[model samples]
Target: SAMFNQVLILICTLLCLVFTGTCGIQHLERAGEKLSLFKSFYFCIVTFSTVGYGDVTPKIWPSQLLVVIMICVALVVLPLQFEELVYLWMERQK
Candidate 1:
């Protein structure tokens, strides 16, 4: 049960981190350029997807590293958290 609770906590924390990261990145990038929220979202997807068209990019090293780390964490960690949630729910039903 404690582990189950921890799973939920981790999921929530990760989600908030991702959302704030997206918003912050978009807002900072927007100061020097023009893009709607949707366009910023699209830029996020492009960055996360590693498609790298060169039309959009992080202007600095730390920001670029953060994007890479976030995407990689999402790819590796989110699926495992989801699987654990499913397991927790099924056990609760029993």
Candidate 2:
């Protein structure tokens, strides 16, 4: 199914960006505080999903900025992916 394949690609892109964000936070936070893998990933999930409760957070500037960049990228990229998927559905429907 084309729809299934498109959705799979969209999922991959999301996960790729999310993993990149997680690794960036993990490495960048090492200079400020000892950030563990679990915390870093959970933080990325929170930030990516836009829930951003801010309980577990980056304490330093670099990590903070990177997180902001990741948010912007995700905000743009994921929405675009969905748009493509929606376009595919629209064409099929018509």
Candidate 3:
């Protein structure tokens, strides 16, 4: 019940994070580089997976800083969700 709700909320949070990161980077880099929405979204996916290929790089300070912050948020948020899933699995196994 409540745990399921938490999982739903976590899913929403991740979606929002990706969407915002995509838009934020696209807007911030507009002055420096011309990144289409698809490119921006692709960069967000690649960066979140930690497979950063220097190809689609962030040229401005604001976008770079947002990328760092987003990674930190991912580090914090993802672990919590993983830990919760593990706890649920352990409980089910018992």
Candidate 4:
């Protein structure tokens, strides 16, 4: 139950991040590349997966800044959750 709850929370967090990043970049890039919401969401998925397909990317400074900020926030957010889950699993194994 605890692990399921933690995973659910993480998934929700990721979805929130994905949508926010998509909207942020979509709005900010309007002057330059003008990505649609679908494209922005695609970019977010590619970026968050670390695949970085590079087909669609931020064209302006504001979107670039937002992407950087999102990455930094994810770096801080994801590992903590994973680490806690790992610790719990390890404890269970003992």
> Candidates' lDDT values, in order?
0.66, 0.80, 0.77, 0.79
Per-residue CA lDDT of model 1 for 1-94, tens digit only, reads 7566968677686656557556757766666665566665665556545576776667765667767687777667656776777777788788
Off by over 4 Å in 1: 1-18, 43-60, 92-94
List all candidate RMSDs to the true structure: 4.8, 1.4, 2.0, 1.6
lDDT of 3: 0.77
What lDDT tens digits, residue by residue, belong to model 2 across residues 1-94?
7788789989899789878976887677777677778787788788767787877786776767788887888888878988889988987898
Ranking by TM-score: 2, 4, 3, 1
Off by over 4 Å in 3: 1-7
- TM-score winner among the candidates? 2
Cand. 4 TM to true fold: 0.84
Q: How would you encode candidate 4's per-residue C-alpha lDDT over 1-94 as one tens digit per residue?
A: 7777777877888899888887778668877767688887888887777888888677665677889888889888878878877876776677
Worst 10 contiguous positions by lDDT, candidate 2: 55-64
lDDT of 3 by residue, 16-49 (tens): 8789878778667777777788887788778667
Best by lDDT: 2
* Model 1 lDDT-worst window of ten: 40-49
Residue 9's lDDT within candidate 3 is: 70
